[PDB]
Design a protein around this ligand. Sequence first.
Ligand SMILES: [Zn+2]
Ligand SMILES: [Zn+2]
Ligand SMILES: [Zn+2]
Lengths: 717, 1150, 89
Amino acid sequence: MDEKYVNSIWDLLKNAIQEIQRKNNSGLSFEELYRNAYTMVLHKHGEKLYTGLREVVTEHLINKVREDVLNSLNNNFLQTLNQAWNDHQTAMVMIRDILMYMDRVYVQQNNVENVYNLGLIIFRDQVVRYGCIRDHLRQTLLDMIARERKGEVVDRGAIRNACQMLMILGLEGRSVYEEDFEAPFLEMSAEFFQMESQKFLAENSASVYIKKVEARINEEIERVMHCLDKSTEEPIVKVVERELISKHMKTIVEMENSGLVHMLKNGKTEDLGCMYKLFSRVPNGLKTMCECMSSYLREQGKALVSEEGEGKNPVDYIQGLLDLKSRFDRFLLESFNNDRLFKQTIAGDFEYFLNLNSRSPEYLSLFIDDKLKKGVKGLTEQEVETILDKAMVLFRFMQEKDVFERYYKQHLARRLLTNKSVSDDSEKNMISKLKTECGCQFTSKLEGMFRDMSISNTTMDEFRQHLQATGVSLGGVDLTVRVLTTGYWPTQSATPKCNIPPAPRHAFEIFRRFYLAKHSGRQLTLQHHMGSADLNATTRKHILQVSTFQMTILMLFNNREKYTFEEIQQETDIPERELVRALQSLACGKPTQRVLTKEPKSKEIENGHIFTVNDQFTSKLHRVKIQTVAAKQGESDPERKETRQKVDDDRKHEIEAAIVRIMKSRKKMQHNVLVAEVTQQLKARFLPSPVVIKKRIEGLIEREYLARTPEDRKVYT
Amino acid sequence: ASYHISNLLEKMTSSDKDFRFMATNDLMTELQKDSIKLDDDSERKVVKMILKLLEDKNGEVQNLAVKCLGPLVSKVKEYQVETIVDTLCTNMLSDKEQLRDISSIGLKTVIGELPSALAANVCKKITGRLTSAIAKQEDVSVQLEALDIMADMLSRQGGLLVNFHPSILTCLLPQLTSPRLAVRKRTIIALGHLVMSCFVDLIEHLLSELSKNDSMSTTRTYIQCIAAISRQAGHRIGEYLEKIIPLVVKFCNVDDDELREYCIQAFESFVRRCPKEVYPHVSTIINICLKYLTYDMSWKVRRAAAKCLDAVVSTRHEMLPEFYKTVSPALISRFKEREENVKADVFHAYLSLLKQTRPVGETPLTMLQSQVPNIVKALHKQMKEKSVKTRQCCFNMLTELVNVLPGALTQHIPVLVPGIIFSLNDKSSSSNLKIDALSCLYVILCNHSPQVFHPHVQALVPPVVACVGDPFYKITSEALLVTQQLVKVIRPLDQPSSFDATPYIKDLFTCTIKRLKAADIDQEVKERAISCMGQIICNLGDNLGSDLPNTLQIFLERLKNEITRLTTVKALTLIAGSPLKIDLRPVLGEGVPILASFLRKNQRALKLGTLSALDILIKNYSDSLTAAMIDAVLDELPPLISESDMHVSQMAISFLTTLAKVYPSSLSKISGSILNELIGLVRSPLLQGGALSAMLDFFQALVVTGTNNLGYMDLLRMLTGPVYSQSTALTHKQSYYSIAKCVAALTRACPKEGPAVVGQFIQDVKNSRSTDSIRLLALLSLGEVGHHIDLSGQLELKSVILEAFSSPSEEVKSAASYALGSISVGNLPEYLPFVLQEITSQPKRQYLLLHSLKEIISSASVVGLKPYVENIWALLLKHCECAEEGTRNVVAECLGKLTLIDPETLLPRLKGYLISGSSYARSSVVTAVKFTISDHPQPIDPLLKNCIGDFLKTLEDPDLNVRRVALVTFNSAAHNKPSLIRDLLDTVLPHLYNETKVRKELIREVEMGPFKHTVDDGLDIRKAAFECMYTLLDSCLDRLDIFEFLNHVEDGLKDHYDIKMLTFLMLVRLSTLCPSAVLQRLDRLVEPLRATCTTKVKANSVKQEFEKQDELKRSAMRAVAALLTIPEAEKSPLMSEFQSQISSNPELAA
Amino acid sequence: KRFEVKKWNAVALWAWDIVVDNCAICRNHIMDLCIECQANQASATSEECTVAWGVCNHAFHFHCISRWLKTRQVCPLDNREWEFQKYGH
Ligand SMILES: [Zn+2]
Ligand SMILES: [Zn+2]
Ligand SMILES: [Zn+2]
């Protein structure tokens, strides 16, 4: 229509929106303004209406808000800014309904921003991005945040509302809100972080530092949520992480006092878990933690695996190692929540420091033998089972299993056959646990040793029944002579043959003849240095005990007294120096329970010394044993080296047993490949030992090496 | 390849053991990668050969065949797995000794290599065969293996087999009465492995079963069975435990040797539960069991009883006093001995009780000192015993005893010193007994006072010399520590001493030199010996002979190591600054260069140690310094001092300070290099407290002494110049403050003042081309120097001050206010009337000099203020005008700071003005008492406590304007000091809840009649009230009333947006703090947030309001997640419907 | 007599048809080397030729049984496969 009608419409619409924004629009109608918009938009004159919208909004902002916020910059600055935001939004809602009714067609045709977005942008450009309000708002926000971090209370809800306001003002997301504001904000944050951490490292301890820095971390997160907005996480977390924990990583765990080593010494358990909880969050914190763990463990091992000076008891030494292992397992369980890295590093350290001694399998075997026979300490089966499991766990992180099982077999030879020194049920449990702890090139020989016991007592009862049916003579009254095989049973010495009880001689001859008629082909014999017997003494009739070399000297005393070394060496066909160990068990180094006394009281052995018997009978019963046998657990030097060389030739022969097959089956060598495979086959048994295999793979070329020999080079050798 | 499989089959058949072994190894390797060529047909023969290899011959082939079965099971199909499972089952169920155990080992690898749907039908068949295998028929070995693999299947497969669980129940329950004693234990393990597997009905069933079964049946293994099943149940068996408790105490009543087992039940049942009445019952039973020694197999009973005592104490910390008093002295002290083990774990129980009397009416210290006497008699009596474990345990008890009580056995030192001498001698028993004895001696020596020690130390020396001479190095190190403590005990270099020590110094010095000059022992003993000899020299060097130079050169020689460096540096710090001065000229001459070299090791501890050693040498000795080594160290510092380490920087600065008053040439060397470096350092914004004071001293001393062309004139131009050329602030904020304080310290160093003050005057008044940075610097330094050096006349103070005050930059105005505030203190009679007159004169200077007056009161003296303070408070009361609320705030701060000094007389007038003042007056007084709150304890606590309590209880129900003010004050008080509110909390609740709810009188439904705006005018108080509720649960929770709190966080959930979010956070925290106290109203709180997560918005709105509502909904969903974070105790209200819109919220929130 | 022996807990060792007089392969002896070694000297190196014991308890010289292991490994005195269990008497 005419320009007068449209200009009057625009004038009254401007008056109406001014009344809307002036908080005095009670006396106003909405239908009339919606009609104004319809008749203004049907005429295709939206450009002038949008320009007038922009002009009136910006002139309002500059006149009212820019004056009000600047006038009260020091009194309720955030409060008047919040009020201006609320008033602007509550005018913008109705401005939005009207100019959005027109902005439908406007944005479907002119591809411009909507009225609400236009108001947001113009407010950002005119107030929040103002040349003076920016700096004052930044300064007051930073000062209030810093004074809140100091410990004082500020209006955290005001900061919440301001952050939400900047969120809605961004209109895209994290654009304006970040950029400039975030930079000095995070700069002030990192400055504060360093100033607090440098203060906090200068106390003395780390036990209180780690608690206090965890409290600081928690309070940062509390402010992040309540005081600030919803996000503000990733940059704040990253900067506080890098500025506290990454900076303190090198020095907070190596302090002389309240350091990681010290808190591992006394046994602090909350501190270790809390330090894990903090340093598992920082990059490469677990790495330095496990490095310090390994350093401490290696230091402790070198303190314990020291070879200069050997006086440690076997059971005690291994029990200490077991305690350390279980304590570190419990530490990892509570503090490190069973972390893989710490388990791997402790396993590696154990493998590294348990093979530094050739005694470790010896001592572990001694400990298992001591705890296996019969233990009054921890009699119930639960503690025995836990100790057994820890012993097997220690056996896991240990190489060179050959000497371990050789000593285990020797322990079976010693304990198994003494009189009744087994529990009759737990040896199968040990065999089963060993079956699932190493490889299986054995175990069937230990169960084969159990087959020998079974046939032994079946033959015992069958021979007793046969003797009852026959009744040859009175020699075999109470005879228990175990049928023993040479193979499974470990080798004893060169059977130092000794005098055999004259009456029981008939019993042993009868038993041997019974077995030479049982299956006939069995070259039998007696192991003189093994076994035991009971001698009846005679005021009460008590029964003594003898261990495989006592009975001969005892009968030599019983038949005739006033004997000496010449008497026991002359008419008895008696063995070598082992006799002196056999004899000293009765007189030399004896407590006040002596069954044999001599007039020449001296430590050394004489020739013409008279032997007598003293009462010394504290045990007024019919069952007294001598405990000189299996007394020392030191495993002295000569037996050490002979068993070491026995193990050496056993290793060397098993190497051949594998080497022959690893030629006979697979294709031949490329001069450097077969040793890797032969070590792969035998890694579970012992160390690779890359020198002996090299030295003897040319040891069988002379005898039984066929096909293309490995060192063919020029021609198949 | 298929050909490879053919070849290995052929070898196995031929029966060649080498070929069989290598074929099996090749089979394992090829199956491990990806089962190369294993078709249905080829699979039918490989499993046949694998089973045959399992059954036939040499054990080497057998284990490799078991290994192949592993990869096979994993890389084979459903039929073949089932087949091999059935075959292993039949092998173990039939005869043939070997087949049984090898098949049992194989079946373990089956359930180990197969975890799921594939293994479900697989394990079903295994369970089916095992159920028939565990029949009641006597097949002892067969059931042994069967229960083994049975508990195995439960242990590794627990997430499945839920259907077969009743079937294994019906065949496992009647297996607990078999005569053979091992299968009963295996069945207990089976039921434990069965109860781990989360099947509820089952456990209730078997519990009712054993309940009905308690009918006089002769069986103890079933008692230990229920013991172990309770052990494995963990934290769900509280009610069933309450059920069995009468049964177990009744079964323990009858005299039997298995009191050990029933006490195992009792202690386990109690150790894994946190009750409120079960401990008495358990304690009663084991006190009986510990008294149970009559005359054997009765030791295990007492062992169990002592373990139970340990558990009891370590767990019920809140019940300590009465139980401690009534059981521990009598029982533990009287039975502080038996044979080997019950004695030992009785000591272990007392060790846990010692750690419970450690917070580190009748306080723990009182009952501890009550325990002490009988304890010392008992441990001495134990010392009479010969066993090594006994003495070691007594040593540990003694160590812990003095760790929980400083004085502990002060009167008993004469009693237990002979025991220590005895344990430090022959008859072997060294092991760890020597280590324990030496550690106990060290603790006893260090913790108490030498006053009771010198006699029994003079009676103590020879044995510790013997332990030092002991070949073992651990005992040597412990003895070295003991000698160090003893020498600290014979000397007292701090408190007066009279005890003569010459022969003991002789002997101790002899053993220390013998141990020290080894160079062949471990690092620990080396460090201990070095520290001990350093202490030897430091304490007892005045009676020492001619061995001092030899030992000192030995210290030099041993210093040059990689491990001994830190200990030697510490000993060098200790040897210096000693009452008994030690000639250290050769050391200085050869160590200052080596310490300078030590500086460049990037080792923080080493840096600090060598810095302190150099400082202390230059401090006391200050005699053998020449140019060479001082030049070396002064060249060494500049790399050391840096922004990355302010504490090391502080130590280096302090070394510079002391050296400044020692070497004249060093001052010039420092001038050059250190002045360059510290000029670089000053501009850093982290200069504070420690380092600030240090640098201030550095400049003070450097300027007051002679320096290379460096003083006032020179340095002042080299301080202002940088910032003047900087012009546009290139720093951030703190460089100006640091430079101003440095200039102030420099000015007060030499009082030839008047040039510099006039120059700063010109700079502040020369408006032409003077940067705001220049202005800031000038004003700040001016105020800082006026602080101490009364600027007094010096041209025009007033003019310059007001000129800088009227600045267009707010920072310049703040600097001017701070400068005036600092000026007034020092010349108060002249400058303070100025402040009053101008505050009462101008209305803008009113506010600005009110800030300056706050500064004035904060940084003034404490003696020359009283009449001035009275005038200040008179003006402050008169100047309560409401032009701006900021003026009200600053005047309130000034009133509070005035109250801090002489509160006694001024406070009652403040309360009276509260009572009789106007609304703005009440706001002023309550804000003043708000900021009267400190952050740390002050001697104002009682009066301020009572009076701020009166303030808050009187000013929490006034007008809405004054209401929110008192609310924010109470918020501040609650956050800062919980210890001044106390009873006020109960009186605050009603007043706070009055405004906590919505007020339907202030909405006014106005300013838009037709258009319906709801302006609240009460949201300010509501936000403040809910902020107080946040700080309430944050500081004081134990005595806070919960029910009303939860009702009105519900009403807050019915409130507006900001209160909605605040209540969401409140709910999250409160549900976390007190879970059970939130479960009562979890459903009640669920109603509001459910209505919140259903409210929709019309399409008429704009997408920004949509993001707002999405934020609200996400906060509500986080609140729901927090309410679900309670340990699953409700599973009730509506259970989170899945819809197209809401379901996105938890997806994006997880 | 003053003292009389009542009980014994001895042990009896037994061996299969090893024939201490003559080897089962070389027919020389259970000890004192084999046909492939003859004398004691001439590069014996502490005489690295011991007796081998198996699970069949049959004992031969290590050289004898190792040289026999070329073709047959069936323990000719029996039908067992001749495991290796021991080295030396
Ligand atoms: Zn032969
Ligand atoms: Zn044979
Ligand atoms: Zn030979």
